[PDB]
Write a protein that binds this ligand. Structure first.
Ligand SMILES: *C(=N)C1(NC(=O)[C@@H]2C[C@@H](S(=O)(=O)c3ccccc3Cl)CN2C(=O)C2(c3ccc(Cl)s3)CC2)CC1
Ligand SMILES: [Cl-]
Length: 220
């Protein structure tokens, strides 16, 4: 495999978005993964509607601005036969009645793949598939106030993930020091957070923060 991967370099990734004051991280993770797989299919990068997921995927198990699962979002797109563009169904950061309109659907999915709970399996998927939805433990002040460098939190959990994000690659920092690898992660907290909205999550450090515990992507 390559020593570093960055799917932004191939046009798979929309700019950083901001979920605002709604607990819709799961929806941004899911649209990021589906944006990448739709691009893999068609060669067209089209921003997808998180609002459509927030408002409409309750029957699949999601809970709007109070949380959800990326796999439930993928199941919704499959069940629903489509997902509207960001343009047609703009983001409001509040849960409303479903306004899905099939006229403006620009994406589909046929299922989803759950990667096994192994950083090696996650690496193979990132190297070959595209951006991957992942669950992480973001429940520490260190994450909230992250600015730069490889994020490592000694108290991070590999089981109590609480935040859905998107792995768009991996790499390493030049150093003689032990443990210099990271996952390149797109967050949904705007470019004002982290490294222009991204975080380098420690890689190959005992499944740090659970990044390989609930990784998945949609089939299209
Ligand atoms: C995002 N803004 C918030 N976080 C969530 O909605 C997260 C996203 C997933 S998770 O934590 O990434 C996850 C954990 C374990 C297995 C798979 C995943 Cl994808 C779930 N989540 C939650 O807050 C949970 C929910 C589980 C089922 C739901 Cl429906 S919501 C409590 C774990 C802050 C909202
Ligand atoms: Cl939130």
């Amino acid at each position: 495999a390559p020593r570093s991967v960055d799917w932004r370099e191939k046009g798979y990734v929309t700019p950083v978005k901001n979920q605002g004051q709604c607990g819709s991280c799961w929806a941004f993770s899911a649209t990021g993964a589906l944006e990448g797989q739709m691009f893999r299919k068609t060669g067209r990068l089209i921003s997808l509607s998180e609002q459509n997921l927030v408002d409409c995927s309750g029957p699949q198990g999601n809970e709007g601005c109070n949380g959800g699962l990326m796999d439930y979002a993928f199941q919704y797109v499959q069940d629903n036969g489509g997902l509207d563009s960001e343009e047609s169904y703009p983001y409001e950061a509040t849960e409303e009645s479903c306004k899905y309109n099939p006229k403006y659907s620009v994406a589909n999915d046929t299922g989803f793949v759950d990667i096994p709970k192994q950083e090696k399996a996650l690496m193979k998927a990132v190297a070959t598939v595209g951006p991957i939805s992942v669950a992480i433990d973001a429940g520490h002040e260190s994450f909230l106030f992250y600015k730069e460098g490889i994020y490592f939190e000694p108290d991070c959990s590999s089981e109590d993930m609480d935040h859905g994000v998107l792995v768009v690659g991996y790499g390493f920092e030049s150093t003689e020091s032990d443990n210099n690898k990271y996952w390149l992660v797109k967050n949904s907290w705007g470019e004002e957070w982290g490294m222009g909205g991204y975080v380098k999550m420690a890689k190959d450090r005992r499944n740090h923060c659970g990044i390989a515990s609930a990784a998945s992507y949609p089939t299209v």
